[PDB]
Design an enzyme around this catalytic site. Sequence first.
Site, PDB file in Angstrom:
ATOM      1  N   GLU A  76     -57.810 -28.581 -15.751  1.00 43.45           N
ATOM      2  CA  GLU A  76     -58.898 -28.656 -14.782  1.00 43.45           C
ATOM      3  C   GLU A  76     -59.031 -30.057 -14.195  1.00 43.45           C
ATOM      4  OE1 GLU A  76     -62.016 -30.242 -15.045  1.00 43.45           O
ATOM      5  OE2 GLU A  76     -62.546 -29.505 -13.049  1.00 43.45           O
ATOM      6  N   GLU A 149     -54.155 -39.137 -15.641  1.00 46.47           N
ATOM      7  CA  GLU A 149     -55.426 -38.429 -15.688  1.00 46.47           C
ATOM      8  C   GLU A 149     -55.681 -37.873 -17.086  1.00 46.47           C
ATOM      9  OE1 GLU A 149     -58.608 -36.564 -13.107  1.00 46.47           O
ATOM     10  OE2 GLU A 149     -57.464 -38.413 -13.282  1.00 46.47           O
TER      11      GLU A 149
END
Length: 966
Positions: A76, A149
């Site tokens: 996500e 990330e």
Amino acid sequence: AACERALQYKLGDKIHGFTVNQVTSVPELFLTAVKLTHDDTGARYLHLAREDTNNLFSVQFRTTPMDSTGVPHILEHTVLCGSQKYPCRDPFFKMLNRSLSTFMNAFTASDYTLYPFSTQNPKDFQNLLSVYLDATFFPCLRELDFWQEGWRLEHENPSDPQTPLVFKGVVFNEMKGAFTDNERIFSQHLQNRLLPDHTYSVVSGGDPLCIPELTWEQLKQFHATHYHPSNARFFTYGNFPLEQHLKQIHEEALSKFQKIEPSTVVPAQTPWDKPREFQITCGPDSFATDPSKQTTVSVSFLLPDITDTFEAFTLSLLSSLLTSGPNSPFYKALIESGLGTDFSPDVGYNGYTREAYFSVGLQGIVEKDIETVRSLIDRTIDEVVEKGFEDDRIEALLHKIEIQMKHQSTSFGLMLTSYIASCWNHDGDPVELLKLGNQLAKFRQCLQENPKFLQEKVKQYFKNNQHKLTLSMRPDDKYHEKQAQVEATKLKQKVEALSPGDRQQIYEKGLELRSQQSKPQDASCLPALKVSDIEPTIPVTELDVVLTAGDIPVQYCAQPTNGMVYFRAFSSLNTLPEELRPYVPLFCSVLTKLGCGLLDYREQAQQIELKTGGMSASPHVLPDDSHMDTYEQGVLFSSLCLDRNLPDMMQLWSEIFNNPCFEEEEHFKVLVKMTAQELANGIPDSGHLYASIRAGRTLTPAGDLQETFSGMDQVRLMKRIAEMTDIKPILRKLPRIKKHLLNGDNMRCSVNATPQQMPQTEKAVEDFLRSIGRSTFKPWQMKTHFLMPFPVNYVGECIRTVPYTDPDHASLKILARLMTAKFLHTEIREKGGAYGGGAKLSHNGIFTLYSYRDPNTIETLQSFGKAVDWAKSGKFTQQDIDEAKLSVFSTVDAPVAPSDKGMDHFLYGLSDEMKQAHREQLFAVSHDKLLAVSDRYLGTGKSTHGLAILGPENPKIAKDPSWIIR
């Protein structure tokens, strides 16, 4: 209207490849629900057509992890860094400057993930809907984006290979901060233990020790299995037509997939047969806190699945009955027993999981009393089984449910999606969950036809249920020490297993990531808007100040509040002695829960919850937009009530003004301890707020006083107050504050209500107002570091600009949004690994610099130095300024609910002549002005700089003599 047209879909209609299955009306909510399914990909569509502008679209994907690696959260978290149609870097935090959307953000919970966004301008809606469709169904999962990330290895300098390789990432520090929260630790352990059978057994957010076991191929496989549109729930809310949404979806994404079966369903947890017990350990209590009393206990049961809506409804009501208010069984048994300081985390019903799990228990107790507490709880359940519940409390609860059904809010779509997500994640019909009226009617009927209904339910689910549990947690002074040591050992284990070729590969990949970050690159591939789309004029609202007996200005507003009524009343503080200011927050906290005239606190609370829908009081400091150091302080005795209960509430307010009970002492001790604990818990989850407030204390009289009312000084004071055993000296202060604040001398009321209820409100407010008594600043620099045992850091720093009506203030609100969107978001979140950072221009004129969950401090203070240099150099194009305008004018024009229009004029004094005056100083912003304002205020030697950092101890920080350590 949206509802009337939306009620005109016939069963079995094919709409752009979708199909019509069920349409229903929800008049108590004023909307229409439509259920559709695609003929090929099987994705479910729910449309809540409702005549409100702020429309919302959300896409849901059931992510059922089977380990603590943390794959669904990172999947996500990363699909917001590129896709096929928009291969530009970071499509999300670039569309945060090319859209008028008021909400655009994404969430992930235990067994699902959900990307919602809500906006008002239909073209912007289409643009962002396309962006999400492409950036979730067709993302280019660059390995370097995972490195940036998720987690990665990196030296202390990606250019120098002569410094050790440590872990870096954003999800990594995000979870470190999230589990800085003791409540979150407890709730995580509780959910894992009580549900150890399947996916709930593992930390779906990923444990900060178990993240590094995740590899790129695992991520790609998780995506290929889970994000296929057979695992897709589509939910849209509002007045825009349906054909637009469905046509765009089908002819943009769904056409490129085919049907599969999403073998991801979470199965039921197996029933236990013997009550269990466990033990977990956590981090210490912030500051001077007695080590003895920091234990926590729970006794958490297991409720049926939430597929049966009515059973969950009844059990939610029952849990609220058992837990909420000083009239609940467990409040009298546990809270006033004198052992704990508050309920346990996750207290009351929790239907987040597949089966609801009631929880209850204390915290702040000594360990030797744990069995005591357990006995209490057990004994208390017995009592209910032989007594039941008093009818008036049931009526008050139903009245509160009705209020929450009727109260109109700005963000209804977000609440609807976040409320039906869990129930609809498990093939449960979500329409039945929307009909609160039908289920309240069912509840009344079932309670009336059989008097012992709730007694039987408590017996069935609290007496005869064997799936109990007794968790108990203790503070470890070295919990985060041990976490750091095991993480370092895992680092060493991961590093020595690497060949030199792989070391060179890592070094070159880190350099390439740095290049991909710091390279000024294109963003023109994304759709966008123009400042020619921002509306030029805003409609005006009707206000009518009416002096009423005899010098009390009382605003009124005629809004469609659905038959509800919103009273408010600002009372000043200028006559109060200065020494009693610190306890004013305490006075407001306990004002409405101590006893009104002929009533005692249980009776008064039963009243408050029977007539009204809440009656609060909270100090505010409102600054002036014509001078820097002009502030109006004062308490805001807000309230709320249905239409019929208006006089009753008003009578209550009179009782609260004329006759407050300042002699009930035990309940005052209880409330002081409970709220001091509640303030001590929250310091992490709002670290940047506290840091900014402590920094800006020394700049403004308004800033210093707001620091007194809500800064760290408040929690420090409340901790000092809840520690004492003699609460007489503090309870003897409250009359001295009631005699200065509960009157009508410096007071201005307000009302929001439908016009049909306006004269009755006139009468009631005048009755209340006749029923009450009628008796050089030199900015200076300070630095401050708060030692707080946290893994991550919270940094604040402020700059003193000009106030709201000043012409320069208009341009700074573009620069502040400009620095955040271009420079700070990169050199802090995408590079420094923090969860968040940037700058804002407060409505008072404070240019504050902040960082949220920052692994490092000194770099960010230096990254803030590079923030002014970048802006003063003008290294931004003209469209960048076009970006900031589109952003601010999506913040300034955030829709306001009938409940607050217009509370800005009533509080701050912004007539629509001054808003439109400012709104046109923002359209008049040009490249030369941003240069002209940046070098004026933000430059060195041009203002005063207050600094404040929250975070673990640091050698360099504690060394500098120009710093203050607290």
